[PDB]
Each structure stands twice: as C-alpha cells, then as structure tokens.
C-alpha cells in the first residue's frame, strides 16, 4: 500500500531575519541527518542559546517540526551515523541545559497515519541498545503506544504490526537483552494492552511464521518471557474478541508454537505450578502423561476444537489436529457415540430411500402405512437441514439433503391436491437420494477418500471443460441449423436437423458415438457442412485431451495424501456436529474429564493418556551411547 | 492401552497416634521422592528406630506400602535425584542396621498387572549402573522374573517386552558394561527362560527393528554375547512353540540380523567351532565358501523356507529370500525338478482343456475314448485341489481350479442322468479354464509380471468403481422405469423400457456406446427423462476419470518393481509346493547336502557355493590403495 509520506533524504517534490532563521533551523536538521560535523552542531547550539538569551516553548517549537511533529533527535536516530551516539549525548546534554527535557523526550510523532511514536521505538527498530538504555535512564516513558494506522493495519500485506509497545517490539524483533533490561525496570508494565487489547503474547502469535522454519525467534522468546513472570493472570486474559492467546494461535494456522503452548513440562516449583503436560510413570519408551483441558473439552464458549475445525481460512487444520489432546479426544468421542449414531442415521436414511423407490415404482394398506411415516421422515430431515442451511467446500451436501426432502414433501403435497406433474418431482427426488450415498462413504477410508477425489474432480476440473464445450456446441449448432434451412419437403425425416435442438442432440450423440453421421441431405452445400462437422469432432478431441493433460499435473504427489487428510477432517466435522447434537445432560454423562492436584491450591480437569514411541525411544537409546 | 495405575507425583483423584503415624510414613515416602533433605531422612530414620526400640516384620510393613507392594527404595529409584545414590547408600545402611535386608531387597512389587519386579529392574531401566553394581554386591537376586502383564503383552502396540530379566533388559537397552558385570558374576544364569521360554536371544530378536537403520544395538550385542559364552547349547534351545531363534527371527520379518545369524565367519579356535559360513580358496573376487543347513534343507519339522514363504503377515519376504543359501537352494531345486514338472502339468492341463472345448463344440468311438480319460483328469485334479482348498491373496487360483473340475464332473454326471441344463454348466467350465491360463504365466517373467499386475488391478482398483457404478445404475433404472410407466399401446416396441431389466440393459449398452438413444417415446414428460439420462452419462464419465486418476498414483515408482518381486515369490511358492509333492525316497535322491569336518567332533551337512563379485572386489581394490 502507498500513502502519505515520511522523513527522507530526498524530497519527492522537484530583512535577513527569516533567511537566517531558515538557514539555522534547516542546518540543525541537516547536521542531525549527516551527524558528522558535531562542531557545527555545537556552534549552532551556542547560537540558538544566544538567540534564546536575547521562551522554552518557542525554542522547542523551532526545534520540533510542526509538519509531521518530528524532532531533531528523532531525525538523528533515523539517520544512523557512527557518532550518532555521541550526537545523541550532545543534544541530550543541551536539552538538559535547557531543562524542557520532559516534554521533549515524551514527544509523540504527530501525523495522520502516525498518531504517536516515541524515539525509543526508533532506537529499538534501528537496533541501538546502548542508546536505548541511555534514553530509558534519561527518564523515558516506556509505556506510550503507537496508536497509529501504519502500526495497526487492516490487512497484513499492507503495514507492520508488532504490538504497539517498545517491549513487544523488542520481543518480535531479535533483541533479547533489551527485554531483560525492560523486565528489570520497575515502571515497566506487562499487562498493558493495545487498541485491540492483544498483549505481548497475542502480538507474538501474530508474527510467528508456520512451515517449521529451522530457526524461530517466537518459539524461544515466549518461553523466556513466561518463565520470568510467573502468572496464570497473563494467558487468562483476552483480546477485544474475548480470545485467549491459545485460541488466537489456533484461529490462525500457527502450528509448532501451538504445540509448545499445549505441552509445557517444567520442573521448578513455581514453574511446575505454571506447567502443562504433567508426566508420571515414564519407563523406557512407554509413558503415561496427563494433559489439561480447561478451554479444550468443547464446553467452553468458543473452544479450541470448534475453532480448528469450523475454520476454513487456514488449510493447515490437519497438521494442528495430529496433536495429542485433540486427536485423543476425537478418537474417544468417536468410539463412544459416533460409531453408534452414524450407522444409526445411515440405516434410517437407507430405509427411507428404499421406501421412496418402491413407492415410486408402482405409480396396499401397508403401503399407505409406510407412506405415512415416510412423510414424517421427510419433514424431520427437512427441519434438521434447513436450520444449518440458512445459517452459514463442505456444506454442499446439506443443501442437497434439504433440496431432496423439500422436493419430496412438495410432490406428496401436489398428490394431495389435483396435480399431474407430481410423479416427475418424485422421481427426481429419489435420484438425488442415491447421489447422497457418497455422503456416507465417509464411514470408510477406502470408499471415503475415493469420494473425496470424486467431489474434487467434479468441482475443479470438469466445469472449465464443460463450459467451453457447450459454447462450441451451441455455435456449431446454429451454424448447422442455418445450413439445414432447406425445408423438409413433406418428410420431417428428410430434415434431420430442421430444428436447432435436434441438431444439438445429434451432435451430442456424435460425441458419444451413438448417432449416424448422415451424408448431408436437405443441405444446399454439403461439403462445407461436412468439413465443419469434422472440425467440431477434432476440437472436442483436443479439448478432452487437454483436460486429461491438466488432470495429471494436479496429481503430482498429493492425490492420496490430501485425500486421507480431507477424510480425517470430514470425520472430525461430522463427529463434532454429533457432539453438539446431543443433550446437555448426555454431554454431562460423556464428559471425559479427570481431576488432578498438581499445586497446593489448583484442582483442574485433566486427561490421562499413554504414549508408546518405540522408534523415538530406540533413537534415544542409540544416541545415548 | 489404558489401565490400572502407577506411582506418580500427582494423584489423579481430587489420639495423635494415627496422625503422627501418617505424618511419619508419608514424610518418609516424600523424602524418598524429593531425595533432597537427607537430614530429614536421618531424623525420620532415628525416630523410626526409636519407635521400634520402644517387630521387624511390622517395621518392613510400615516401610513397604501394601497397596502396590512398593517400598521406599523403589520410590527413591523412581524419583531420580542427584543425591539419590547417597540416599540409596543411607537407606541401605539403615536396613543393614535393622538386618531385614534379605526380604527387603528381594521384594517383589505386588500388583495385578505387576506380579513381580525387582528394584534392580528400575536401576537398569533408569540407567544407573553404579547403583546397579552396589545393589548386586549387596546380595541382590539377579534371576527373578517380572512375570507380569505390562511386561508380557498380547499385542506389541500395548506394552513393553524385553525378556523379563535384568540381563535381557541390559541387552535390549543400551547398557553394555552392566552386561559385562553380570556375565562376570558367578550366580548369573544365561540359560534361564521366561514365561514363553524365549531366552535372551529370542528376546533380542523381538526388539531389533528392520529397515536397515544406520545404528543398531541388537546387531552388535548378539555378537558379543555369543562370543563370550561359547556354546551350541544356546541357539539349539527353543521357545514354547518349539522355535529356534533363527526360526523366530524368520517368522518375524527381521532381515539384517537374520543375515548375520546365517553367516558368522570367525577365526579363533573355539570361535571356529562356533562359526558359520566356512570359507576356503578365496582369490581376488572369486571365492568358494560353504554354508550349513542343519535346519534349512526343508527336511526339519518347521524349516526356514516354509516359514519365510508360507507366511503372509510380513510383506518383507522378498528381502529375506535374496540371502545366499535360500536363493541358491531355490535355484538348484528349480533347475533339477521344477523346470520338468511345471511344463509337464502345463501340457496335461492344456490337453485337458482342448479336449473339453472340442467335446463342447459338437453338442465317435475315439470321441468316447477321450471323453473317458477327461473324467479321470477331472476327478484327479479335483481331489488334488480340494485338500488344499479346505485346508487354509494367492490361493484364489486353487479355489478356481477346484470350482472348474467340480463343475465338469457335475455336468458329466447330469449328462449321465436325464437333465437338460448340463450343457450350460459344461461351457461355463471351459470358459473358466482359459482364465486359469494366467496361472501358468508364472512360467515366464515377461508374461508373469503382467499377470501379477492384472490380478492386482482386478482385486484392488475395479471393485470400488463397479459397486458405485451399479448402485447409480439401479437408481437411474428404477427412475426411468417409473417414467416409462406409459403402457405399450399394443406394441411392446413402443415401450422400449416397459421392463426394469430392459432399461438397465439399454443403459449398459449406452455406457458402451452400442445402443440408440431414443427420443423419449411412451414418456409422459420426456425432457426430464432426457436430462436425467444425460446426468447419468456425465456421472459415469467422471467416475471413470476418477478411477483412472487414482490408478496412476498407485504406480508412483513400484509397479514393475513390486511385480518382479511378487513373481519371484510366486515361483518360490510353487517350487516349494512341488518339493512337498514328491515322495520321501525321491527327496532322499535329491537331498543336496554335502558333509564337512570343521571341528574335531562336528560332522554337519553343508552346501558349497561360489561367489563372484567383480564390483565389490573392485571397490575393495580401489579403497585398499
């Protein structure tokens, strides 16, 4: 993004009292920029003090540029010089000699996109730590926020976000030692929060890249910071949206850092009070270990699982899922109730569709008896589908179920009244029904991944082929109809293509191979007709070959691999939907939580799982000696 | 697997004589756990001795927890501390001062899943060797077995198996020096055997991973152990199942360790008495070398080859086969009798089927003459097939042969009686016959691997396509039959689809391309009919394209590679089946064994083979200088 302008060496635009004033001020700024002839700065400072001697507010105004609110020290810090430390010392000494130092160093850069900015921000972004400690020691407020536009962007591509504090900036950026200095300082605040309210930790999450980079600053800095300040009062806090930093890292597709946040095994006493993933009884490869689930068991307001699974703007959900508590929870919930209810609804729907088929085939008293309850199932499934359909590449099947039951109830209704078209609607219904059998191939891996591939092909690859095919079809169709304008001469069979749609249909038969390529009869110029038709055949062939080419390249190496992952995701989505489907009291009966006493005064929910890693253990054994 | 519970820091559950007793005992346990304030342990020990002074059985009971049978020393060993060696020394000194030391250190951890466990087990699993030598020196029984559940699991995924002894644990785990200490000790037993009876070596086999890992503890430990104790009395022994450690490693798919076990060239005198793969006359690349076959020539009760080949739960059989004695044996047996008998049975079966064909084509005296002997071949092949068919992805062809001959004898019988259907059965028979020609494409590599690919495709890829195809077919069929409910009006040809099966058949013709897509006649609403049918066509196309996609991905790089391996395996299976087919006396005539005199008192069977490795030799030549 391109926008309003900043301090730069090169301006983009192409009595002697006023002239002397301009010379002196601009020379001050230019000496700050070059930062070389500090004797020039000394003479200019002596002259400014002499002018003031022959008032401090006007002095600071002559020093502080009113255009962007930029001061000489800020410009000096921007233009990084070898002596720039010396220049900062000199200017600081002169400001002390003037004694307007408070309002000076507390200057907020005044601009539209920059409502506020300390010089310390620049000291840190520029990586000067010695100067940072000096200005901090000088009496610098380390708590003011860069509540601006460039710092708080709407989109990540346009703008730089770090946390709107010095400390968050030191953390996001490399500089750790400065973090130690700021933590040591007494007037420092950690629990201060930005405009959105995201604290330091939330800010850290907004920056850690995924993809398992070899060296990551955020994975370590978070650990150090949390180890220093021992508090559950830090991660318990929330942003504007009421989101925990855990939940925030989950919303975004941030993997390895999330893995860390969910397993913090640490030995010291207060650390143990802070720890997560409490371990016991480990013995060679085998190990029991228990986790905690205070915001993870799906009972919370906006739990972790609902955020991982119902979020489609990531595509990294599968990686997140393979973590311990999540995967174990899904497996447990499956084995407890999904393996029941899934087959249950499968059998209901199967009986339903068979009944529909038989009732459609024969168009007695027991026939009416079944036909009654079929309307009940139709109405029930329609009511269940509509709520999710109105409230919203996965939910297509829901719309399809809703369409089916809608059509069935409509057909039954028009049979209740005096209508003839009803049978038509009816049969279309049951046809759609059998397509929805694909919905239940999720029950099995071998059929499920196949159905996933089928749906992917039907959505991605065929439409581009079919659109261009139909436009060629229509163009050739009108062409050939124009050639076939010769009247039938008392025999419509002599005019095979007298109708446009008839010619279309024959071309489709041709593309299959059923038809009869007639020598052009009832045609004025038959050879042109024939050449044209041949051309159509050729273009269909090459178009087909092109989609067939383009198909193989999408399947480089990730066909089966993405298929299995997507199957697992689909199972997760269904399992969690059923988990919401149950009552509250049944969920009380299924709440898998186990308590624990890790602290003197902490009694939290927990999940005990066993882990068996022959391979990692054998590596551990081999490397140990 | 998740089950009953263990010693842990954190319990999962959420007069002053009794209170003082609880305080003292729990403080003893907690001091053992923390292992820091040894002065607290000293004061507690002084207080316990004072309480006992104002009896040793009650002392050990107050010390030994009766819940899980766990003692203070065991808990101390579990909680590993820096001073834990010092703590063990102190507690040991106090136990000596009490003099109940025997029953103390011989304590068996008493639990349901843990019938018994020494502290030394923990000393070793925890890797403390110094403490191990101390407790061993203290008078520790090193022979007691962990005859429990967790140590002896049914399934490998759930549980940890090592051999149920200290020594087996030291061996399976890294610790070699402890093995030297235990071997040096006089009261040590090597020939002691576990519940299953698998000794140390059998146990080692249960742990060595395959896949040729770069560093493997089992490959070396086995060598050292066997070199120390010079005995054929060790590998001659067997488990509960009567299996040798060789046979056990063969049953499992354990490759490189098996390669080692089958070739042990070693130079020292007693070692030579132990050695395998006796070498002579090696000279540059060329080398003669002879192996031994005391349990490998297929005459033993449960030989190596029968175990490699008739075992399907591995999939690593091909790798095992390329070893020297096996491969040479198979090649020799082939060249001696299989190249005969295979072509023999091929020609018999070929004459048989041709006779069947001709007799089926013409429905004289020589015709009856051939027809007589055909029944003989049918009965004979049926008898040979049924025994293997009843006694049981390879044996499908056997069932097919049995089906064929059964059908033939049935048809001949019903021709013997007064039946008309016989001809039908007859022809079906001969049809199946020609499919079984694939059975004999094993005779050649070029045709054999092709047939392997064909059978794989027919088993794996087409069924998933065809099931979903037929359900679409049936759904669309009932739909279209419902639309075609318009009566024929005196002309069944006007009702092309009046019958359900007829419409099915026409759709199949359509999917081929033979039929005639009729403009919908005898149809109430023809446009819906037409759209529906078009939809079916589209879905067939995309389904076909999907199986075609999924096909290419299964053939990443292992099509021809797995094909050739499977051909070689199939040859092996047939060759060995014929090897069993022969008489006992003929096998006596074909016994390839050659004797040898390696020892003063050893006269074993042997096989002399020559090995030619130009490449390995040239590498040897180049690296040597």
Residue numbers in the entry:
A (entry chain A), B (entry chain B): 1 to 14, 110 to 149, 154 to 462, 480 to 508, 518 to 750
Paper text:
TRPV1-4 are intrinsically temperature sensitive (thermoTRPV) and have been found to play important roles in numerous physiological processes including thermosensation, nociception, and osmosensation.
We expressed and purified the TRPV3K169A channel and solved its structure by single particle 3D cryo-electron microscopy (cryo-EM). Furthermore, the cryo-EM map of the TRPV3K169A contains a protein density that abuts the proximal CTD and the CD and occupies a similar space to that vacated by the distal CTD upon coil-to-helix transition. Since this density is not sufficiently resolved to allow for unambiguous model building, we built this putative N-terminal region as a polyalanine chain.
